[PDB]
């Protein structure tokens, strides 16, 4: 009525959407590939032909920097300014050949055949202020580190980004398993064992906030962007940096993953989004010029690289779409949706109503118009079967605060 629209009208007016299919395909494929490593709004497109940049202190001698940091790693005392400075200087050790011309947002990163490193992707300015480079456990001279040892330290340090991002209750056993697997990777060829078991977790306990240090996040995204494009001997370093891909794009990513889950084209799936507020949010996600369908674009790491502070692709940015997708997920009994956080300011009651009808529509693997018809025939209200299912899934779950499951328990019971 005044809240919902006939999908026949959405079918006429959503044909302007651009590269929506290609975007869904690329993002879903990238998410799939990333699994091997895992186990007011400002659009990101660069307009001035300058690479992303940060500022660090004066470049250190790599061998001296390695020895200082490895000593800090064993003592669970790392200086984050020194670690960033070392990580940026270590980029020169990760050299490959660009397999094809690499351009993003009008910036020619490299031409086919160019020798490139992660430093090619960004402008890292440096002051003339020396880092601290303190060493403990005795200042006795030690053998110079090999490249493989540098690669292990780089990988271990960068994994503190991923470990820092993991936070919340009932997450430290998962954190323990992740830490253990990361340690194993970086003590297994082509990497070298440079620390004893359980050192990473002890270090992370003192570095738990590092994911909120912008320069460190920036460096993690730079390495991840580089290893995504350039196959490299030490590419497994992405076990720590893969989490920078599509950061703060949980609305767009929920949308693309939702389209794949219901096995529809983006053109057809959009027809089911027939609540009036969806249109603005859907056009927000497919704004032209952002390279959402371009492989290896800066777009994939735009949040970590500082291209935008207010993502148009976040769950809040498209809260109605996001709420709807995860109420459907709740109806389907998907834990990821039950524990997701509701966008309180995006009509979670109406999204839960449409979610119940769509959940019923797709349960167990029919047209958008039929669904619209059923909702209207019930006066825009959930049926008792819907509510029973919603309660069945939520009352039988450990509803987290502000989660979709908690919303269902308080709203339907």
Author numbering: 59 to 97, 171 to 496, 544 to 591
What did the published study say regarding this structure?
In Mononegavirales, the nucleoprotein (N protein, known as NP in Filoviridae) is an RNA-binding protein that encapsidates the viral RNA genome, with each protomer binding to nine nucleotides and forming a helical homo-oligomer nucleocapsid to encapsidate the entire single RNA strand. The phosphoprotein acts as a chaperone to keep the nucleoprotein soluble, prevent self-association, and to maintain it in a conformation ready for its addition to the newly synthesised viral RNA. In lyssaviruses, the interaction between nucleoprotein (N) and phosphoprotein (N) in the absence of RNA generates a complex (N0P) that is crucial for viral assembly, and understanding the interface between these two proteins has the potential to provide insight into a key feature: the viral lifecycle. In this study, we used recombinant chimeric protein expression and X-ray crystallography to determine the structure of ABLV nucleoprotein bound to residues 1–40 of its phosphoprotein chaperone.
Using a chimera of phosphoprotein residues 1–53 and full-length nucleoprotein, we purified and crystallised the protein and solved the structure to 2.19 Å resolution. There was a single molecule of the N0P chimera in the asymmetric unit. Residues 27–447 of the nucleoprotein could be traced, except for a chain break between residues 352 and 399 that remained unresolved due to its being in a flexible loop. The structure of nucleoprotein contained the N-terminal and C-terminal globular domains that contained multiple alpha helices together with a central hinge region that resulted in it having the jaw-like structure typical of Mononegavirales nucleoproteins. The phosphoprotein chaperone module had good electron density and could be traced from residues 2 to 40. Its N-terminus appeared to be essentially unstructured and was followed by two helical domains (Helix 1 Pro8-Arg12 and Helix 2 Met20-Gln40) that were separated by an unstructured loop. The structure indicated that the interaction between the phosphoprotein and the nucleoprotein is mediated by 13 H-bonds and three salt bridges, with Helix 2 of the phosphoprotein being amphipathic and forming a large number of hydrophobic interactions within the binding groove of the nucleoprotein. The ABLV phosphoprotein chaperone Helix 2 occluded the RNA-binding site and interacted with RNA-binding residues Arg168, Arg149, and Arg225. Phosphoprotein Arg12 forms two hydrogen bonds and a salt bridge with nucleoprotein Glu403, which would otherwise bind N-1 Arg357 and Arg361. Despite the two different approaches to generating the N0Ps, the ABLV and RABV crystal structures have a high similarity (RMS 0.69), giving confidence that the ABLV structure was unaffected by the engineered linker regions.
